[PDB]
Structures are given as C-alpha cells and as structure tokens.
Write an enzyme that holds these catalytic residues in place. Structure first.
Site, short mmCIF file in Angstrom:
data_model
loop_
_atom_site.label_atom_id
_atom_site.label_comp_id
_atom_site.label_asym_id
_atom_site.label_seq_id
_atom_site.Cartn_x
_atom_site.Cartn_y
_atom_site.Cartn_z
N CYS A 205 0.71 -1.26 0.00
CA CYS A 205 0.00 0.00 0.00
C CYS A 205 0.75 1.33 0.00
O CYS A 205 0.54 2.15 -0.89
CB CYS A 205 -1.23 0.00 0.89
N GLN B 50 0.05 6.19 8.64
CA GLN B 50 -0.82 5.11 8.19
C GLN B 50 -2.15 4.89 8.86
O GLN B 50 -2.28 4.93 10.08
CB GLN B 50 -0.02 3.81 8.11
CG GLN B 50 1.07 3.88 7.06
CD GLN B 50 1.83 2.59 6.86
OE1 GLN B 50 3.05 2.56 6.96
NE2 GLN B 50 1.10 1.52 6.61
N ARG C 74 1.57 4.25 12.55
CA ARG C 74 0.12 4.11 12.50
C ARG C 74 -0.53 5.27 13.26
O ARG C 74 -0.19 5.52 14.41
CB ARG C 74 -0.29 2.76 13.11
CG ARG C 74 -1.75 2.40 12.94
CD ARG C 74 -1.89 1.06 12.28
NE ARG C 74 -1.94 1.18 10.84
CZ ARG C 74 -1.58 0.24 9.98
NH1 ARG C 74 -1.12 -0.94 10.40
NH2 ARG C 74 -1.66 0.49 8.69
N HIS D 112 -3.53 6.65 3.72
CA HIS D 112 -2.15 6.67 4.16
C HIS D 112 -1.56 8.00 3.69
O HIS D 112 -1.73 8.38 2.53
CB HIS D 112 -1.34 5.55 3.52
CG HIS D 112 -1.60 4.20 4.10
ND1 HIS D 112 -2.44 3.98 5.16
CD2 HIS D 112 -1.07 2.99 3.78
CE1 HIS D 112 -2.43 2.70 5.48
NE2 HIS D 112 -1.60 2.08 4.66
#
Lengths: 356, 356
Positions: B121, B148, B255, B262
C-alpha cells in the site's frame, strides 16, 4: 529572596507552570507577585512591574510586544522570562533549554543578558532526545517529519479535536454495536460526518479528528516553509550557539489527532560511521530524561507512544537503526510532552537558576 | 469471454474490488464464477478452480500458500491475480501498478509470467504520487515517514479506532458542553480513560485514538526495519524493474488515527538541481490521478488531507519546496486511499488487461 512577577499564570501553559512549581516547592525560594489583565495587580502597570527583579510571562506575544518596550524604556535592569515566541530571535535574548545549552546560558548571564525565552516545542523536544549527537559534533543535517498534538495550537483546539472524535463514533453508534455490520458502510457514514457543514472545524480550518493537517502556522514566501518548520533551522542553531555556521534541520510539520504529545520521525545524517551501540550510549548519556527504547515491538508499543508519555518529563527515543542509504544515515523516532519540556519546564528551570 | 474465479470477494478488500468492478462494468467483459470457504463452489476445490482461465483472490496469504502450489501441481496454465503479500517476491511473479510499471508488466506478459500480485500500500501510493521523478531517473534516494490508516491492519482495527475515539470524548462529555471548564481537567480524564483496563486495545496492542504507534508488522533482525519498512526498499525496486541497481527507499512506518488513507512525508534526494516549477510539472505529467497541490494554506487544508481524499482515486502531492540541506533535496507530502490504489485498483486493472 528575589521579587518575581507572574503574568498569564491562569492560561494553559501558565497553569502547567504553576502546577510544576508547586510540585517542586519553587515558591518557597522566591517572593511571588501575581498579575492580571482583568479590571492581584495590573499587568499593564509599568510602575508596579518596575519594582520586580524577574518577570515570568506565559501571556503571549501580543502582551510582550506591548509592555516589554515600555518597561525596558524606564531603565529597568531586571530579568524577562518568556514562554512566547516574540523575543526569541533578538540579539539581547537567549533561547533557553538548560540540559542542552547550560554553557550558552552561563556565559550569557556573565555577559549581562537580561532576556531569557523558552524555545519552540518541536525544537526543544528534539534536542532533549537527540542532543547527545549535537554535543559530540556528530550531526551534519536532520530531516524531520512531525506528528504534532492539538496542545500546540491551543486549549480550544484540544476541545475541538475531542468533539470531532466523539461525533465520528456517534455517526455509527448503532452499527458499531453489532459485529456483523458492513465496515464499508460504517466508513461511508464516518466520512460523511467529517465532510458535513455541522462538523466543528472553526479552530483548525479542517478536520483533525479522523484526519491530519500538513500545515502549521503562516507561510514564509522566501523559502516555502511554514513558521513552525522554519523554527527547526533557526532555533536549533540559536540554542546551541551555531548561528554563524548553521546545521541544516528541515522538514514537514504535521498536526495529528493527539492531545498533548509531539512525536517526531528523523533521518539523521551523521559525520562519522559509528556502531549502533555507541550511538545509543551517546544519546542516553546526555541527560536524565532521555530514555533509549530498544528496537523491539512490545517495548516500543508500551514506551514510545503519546499514551505513555503524556504528563511526564520522560523523553523516549527509539526505532534506532542505520538506514538503507548508508552507515552514516540514522533512523530515530521520539515522543515528548508539549506542555512540559516543550513549554513550561525550560521556563521553570531558568527561574530556579535566577533565584538561586 | 474469459472464465474468472473470485475468492475473498466478501471481505473488505474484496468488497471494494466488487464495487469498483461494478462501477466500471468490468463484469460485461468476463464470465464470473464466485467461490466460498463456507459449508457457489468451494474455494478449496482444486478441480473447479482448474477449469478457469484467471483466478483473482483477496482472501489472504494463508489461502494462497495452501491452494496456489496445489493448483500449479495439476498443470494449470492460467493466470493468478493476488491482493495478498505471499507471492510478491517470487521470481515467477510480478508486482502490478500499471500507471507506473506498464513496461514491466507488458514485457512480463510476453516472457510468459502467469502470476500478478498487487503491491504494498505505502509503496504503491508513493509511486502514484512521485512516479514522475522515478520515470526521469532523477531519484538518488528517498527517506520516508508515514502516517498510516487503520484499514491497512484490518476491518476490526478500524472498528477499534472508532470505539476508542468515542470513549475518549464520552469520558468528558459534560466538561466539553461547559464552555468555562478546565482544559487540564478535561485532558486528565481522557488520558486516564486511554490508560484504563477496559479501553479496547486488543487489535493494536496499544491505543491509537488520541495517540500513534511507531511500529507496523514483524521485526526484520538483519536491518532493524519492520516488515512494512523493509517493503519500501524491496518492492519499489521490483515494481520499477530496478532490482539489479536498487534505489534506496527507507524510513519509519507509523500508525495514526485515520480510517482509510495513508499519508506520507518525504525528503527526496535528486540527482540534479532543477527549478521547482519543472519538478512540479514532472510530477503532474506522470498520470491522470496525481494532483499537484500549490504551497498555499487554504488550498493545502482543503486538498492535502485524508478528509478530502477518502474513497477517491485522487493522489494529491504538495508541500513541494527545496530543503535547507541544498537545492537537490526536495520536500513532498502526499495522501492516498489505502483501499483503492493501495489495494483493489491495481488488481482491478491487471484483470482488465488479462480479459481484453
């Protein structure tokens, strides 16, 4: 004992200073005179301010720009301690962060400098974590990517973040209760609320709640940087006393959904190729607040997070390794409380030195 | 028409693929045969899978590592399209992202490659944004810092994030309604809730709402990188066909509290000093999805955020300027939807080419 004036003690930064000073019993070492802007003495009365030896202010730049010239114009030889950005770059002012620049401060006190100002939050939290590399003359340059808390923007901004978060979950309150519901439907409703007219975004100018904002403060048309990003180059070098031959510290400042802690991601280009164990010892030996977190999952999740460091004096630094670019390229991630080392603590500590 | 088998079409990535294929009327050009793992044909019935030309799976790596070698063992000469990471690094497999690597795919098709896998990703969203710089052989290296979303970890992770956000606000609902309440008191309560036993942290292993986690996936002992970080160097070079002469791509994967987008901060070291306007045009000209956002506050807040890009095929890139390190150092910030270009879209497109 010294006669000390306190302005803006009721605000967010000021309240953290009052709480910290009470905790360390700093008030028994000085004679405190509390001021107010309300219509306790008046903060605009120069004749009352002139009687004091030291003035500690967390009121803001607008106040400083109004009363500081008027007070220094009367011939006053006392000390001005400020938390605001207003006087940081003046030639008769020193940017304070004692565990990192005690030498600049001691030599400045001997030089007759009367104005002492706390540094930019992200800069001070970076130096409290990575100052060891600067002390041993190892830094060539630093590439920064920040994860900034709502704390730095203001008290109403923290409240807006919280309101935004509660409204995001409320839009899908029922759907979240049953485990069989569609996650795509849940997301479509959360995003619709985030984009709605009634979603409170007046303090930020955009949603912070389930998003981020890659812009903090005004633009400097000459460099393309924002003021927050500019302070990384300008203030790091003033704190360390390297303004004549500056070390490049630049990057992007991003506001994320956290309350009190600023987190930063670094790519540090070092001058020498050194073992990883030796670099970890150089940054751990610098001060008593830096905490080197081992490059392990469970310990990183438990130690290197805003959840862990909020309201503490601990400055953990982890994720330490060499990058794929070369052996002189170091990866590092740090977390620190914005209101303490990034605001009230450097102000508290310089006061302690001045009343000693 | 081609006989295509669909496995894992009911999960999160699969549902996005199904919705996208329906929106583009992709089912008009093929013969869809849907599979299931429940007790439609069985996903483990090797004989039924063998009767097909192409197999598109979003089920996961555990399914692939079980069914794939058993299917290839029957002598099946068809195509395998996967959204899972399992076969990405295999020599007879190609990682797909056609607006960036159509040449690698076209040459791979001619050579006889039968396995096409979607990429990581973050790597995919990075290349969709700054692929122009790679196309013109301008990149020496890239240091990455990511922001993220929870969708990268899973559906239940997104649910956990939302539940966390609600509990944080609910802990101070009366205080927030009171315009004169203490912010230090408000924060003390949400931080206490974040640290409480009953706070849902099962999926992440730590709090995400009101915080962050600077560790994604398993540790790679050799380099110190996490698997998510490692995929930066490894996948960028396999996608571009540069595994023989690699371009260093490394950094920190963090994260944050976002649902499906993202965001990434870069410091790009270029091979030559070029004017900013030219770099902006090189980035913009690459594909029709990348959008260069001018370095202005109002436009950045409105355009370069997860709030704006969620659920869209747009890949904005902004905050473009030269860094203080020198004229060959470029700052860039990008935002992209994880479920689209980071998951379902490269899979949708390769299928479109295979059924043509």
């Amino acid at each position: 004992m010294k006669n000390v004036g306190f302005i803006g003690w009721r605000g967010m930064v000021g309240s953290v200073l009052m709480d910290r000073m009470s905790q360390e019993n700093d008030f028994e070492n000085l004679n405190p005179v509390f001021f107010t802007t309300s219509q306790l003495k008046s903060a605009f009365d120069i004749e009352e301010l002139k009687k004091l030896d030291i003035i500690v202010t967390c009121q803001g730049g607008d106040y400083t720009n109004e009363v500081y010239p008027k007070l220094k114009a009367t011939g006053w030889d006392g000390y001005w301690v400020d938390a605001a950005s207003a006087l940081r770059m003046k030639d008769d002012a020193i940017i304070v962060l004692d565990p990192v620049n005690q030498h600049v401060i001691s030599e400045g006190l001997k030089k007759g400098i009367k104005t002492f100002v706390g540094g930019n939050c992200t800069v001070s939290l970076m130096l409290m974590a990575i100052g060891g590399l600067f002390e041993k003359d190892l830094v060539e340059w630093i590439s920064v990517a920040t994860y900034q808390a709502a704390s730095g923007a203001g008290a109403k901004n923290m409240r807006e973040l919280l309101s935004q978060m509660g409204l995001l979950e409320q839009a899908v309150s029922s759907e979240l209760k049953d485990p069989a519901s569609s996650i795509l439907d849940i997301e479509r409703k959360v995003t619709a609320k985030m984009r709605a007219d009634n979603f409170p975004t007046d303090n930020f100018g955009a949603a912070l709640g389930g998003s981020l904002i890659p812009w903090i403060d005004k633009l400097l048309p000459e460099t393309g940087q924002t003021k927050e990003e500019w302070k990384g180059y300008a203030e790091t070098n003033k704190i360390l006393g390297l303004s004549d031959n500056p070390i490049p510290v630049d990057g992007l400042c991003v506001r994320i959904g956290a309350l009190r802690c600023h987190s930063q991601a670094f790519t540090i280009k070092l001058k020498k190729d050194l073992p990883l164990e030796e670099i970890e010892q150089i940054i751990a030996s610098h001060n008593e607040w830096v905490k080197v977190i081992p490059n392990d999952k469970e310990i990183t999740l438990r130690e290197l997070t805003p959840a862990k460091v909020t309201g503490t004096l601990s400055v953990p630094v982890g994720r330490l390794r060499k990058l794929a670019m070369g052996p002189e390229y170091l990866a590092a991630f740090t977390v620190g409380d914005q209101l303490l080392w990034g605001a009230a603590e450097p102000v508290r500590r310089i006061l302690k030195q001045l009343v000693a």
